[PDB]
RNA sequence: UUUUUAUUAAAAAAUGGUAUGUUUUUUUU
C-alpha cells in the first residue's frame, strides 16, 4: 500500500488544512458533526454514543479507546450511553474517530460541540 | 369564329383545474 499501516505517534504533525488522516478539512464543521473537522477550530475531543449496558461503561470505553492513542480526558454519562473521550493530539483523535465508527464495544461516533461549561471553557482555553 | 388552364388550412405548453403551510435534543455547576 501507498499509505502507512502503523499508528500515529506523538510527533506526526501535518499541515493545518489537511486532515491528519489524509483527508481534507472544510470550514463549516458540518451540522451533524459527521466526517472531518474544521480548520477554523481546534478541538481534540469527539462524541461517541451507543450502548449503555451497565455501570462499567467507563472501564469498557477506556479499554476500547486507549489502544488507539494517547488520552487526556474521558467523561462518560452514566444515565445515557454517551462518552466524550478527549485525545492529546489531532492525529490520534481523528484516527480513533475513523476506527471506532460502526464498531462493537453500533457506535455513533461524531465530533464534539462547544462546551457550555464556563469552567470547562476556561481550562480548555 | 376553334380550346384550355388558377385548389387557404392542418399542433403544443400555460391559463385550466386532485391549492397549500407546517413539521426529530452530545456535556453546563
Ligand atoms: Zn494501506
Swiss-Prot record:
Whole sequence portion shown: 131 to 259 of 388
GO annotation terms (biological process): mRNA cis splicing, via spliceosome; spliceosomal snRNP assembly
Intracellular or extracellular location(s): Nucleus
Entry superkingdom: Eukaryota
Role of this protein: Involved in the first step of pre-mRNA splicing. Required for cell growth and cell cycle control. Plays a role in the levels of the U1, U4, U5 and U6 snRNAs and the maintenance of the U4/U6 snRNA complex. May provide the link between the 'nineteen complex' NTC spliceosome protein complex and the spliceosome through the U6 snRNA. Associates predominantly with U6 snRNAs in assembled active spliceosomes. Binds directly to the internal stem-loop (ISL) domain of the U6 snRNA and to the pre-mRNA intron near the 5' splice site during the activation and catalytic phases of the spliceosome cycle.
Sorted UniProt keywords: Cell cycle, Metal-binding, mRNA processing, mRNA splicing, Nucleus, RNA-binding, Spliceosome, Zinc, Zinc-finger
Domain RRM: 44-114
Entry's Gene Ontology molecular function annotations: pre-mRNA binding; U6 snRNA binding; zinc ion binding
Record GO cellular component, one term: nucleus
Upper lineage: Eukaryota, Fungi, Dikarya, Ascomycota, Taphrinomycotina
Family per similarity comment: Belongs to the RRM CWC2 family.
Organism: Schizosaccharomyces pombe (strain 972 / ATCC 24843)
Subunit structure, interactors included: Belongs to the 40S cdc5-associated complex (or cwf complex), a spliceosome sub-complex reminiscent of a late-stage spliceosome composed of the U2, U5 and U6 snRNAs and at least brr2, cdc5, cwf2/prp3, cwf3/syf1, cwf4/syf3, cwf5/ecm2, spp42/cwf6, cwf7/spf27, cwf8, cwf9, cwf10, cwf11, cwf12, prp45/cwf13, cwf14, cwf15, cwf16, cwf17, cwf18, cwf19, cwf20, cwf21, cwf22, cwf23, cwf24, cwf25, cwf26, cyp7/cwf27, cwf28, cwf29/ist3, lea1, msl1, prp5/cwf1, prp10, prp12/sap130, prp17, prp22, sap61, sap62, sap114, sap145, slu7, smb1, smd1, smd3, smf1, smg1 and syf2.
Domain notes: The C-terminal RRM domain and the zinc finger motif are necessary for RNA-binding.
Protein known as: Pre-mRNA-splicing factor cwf2
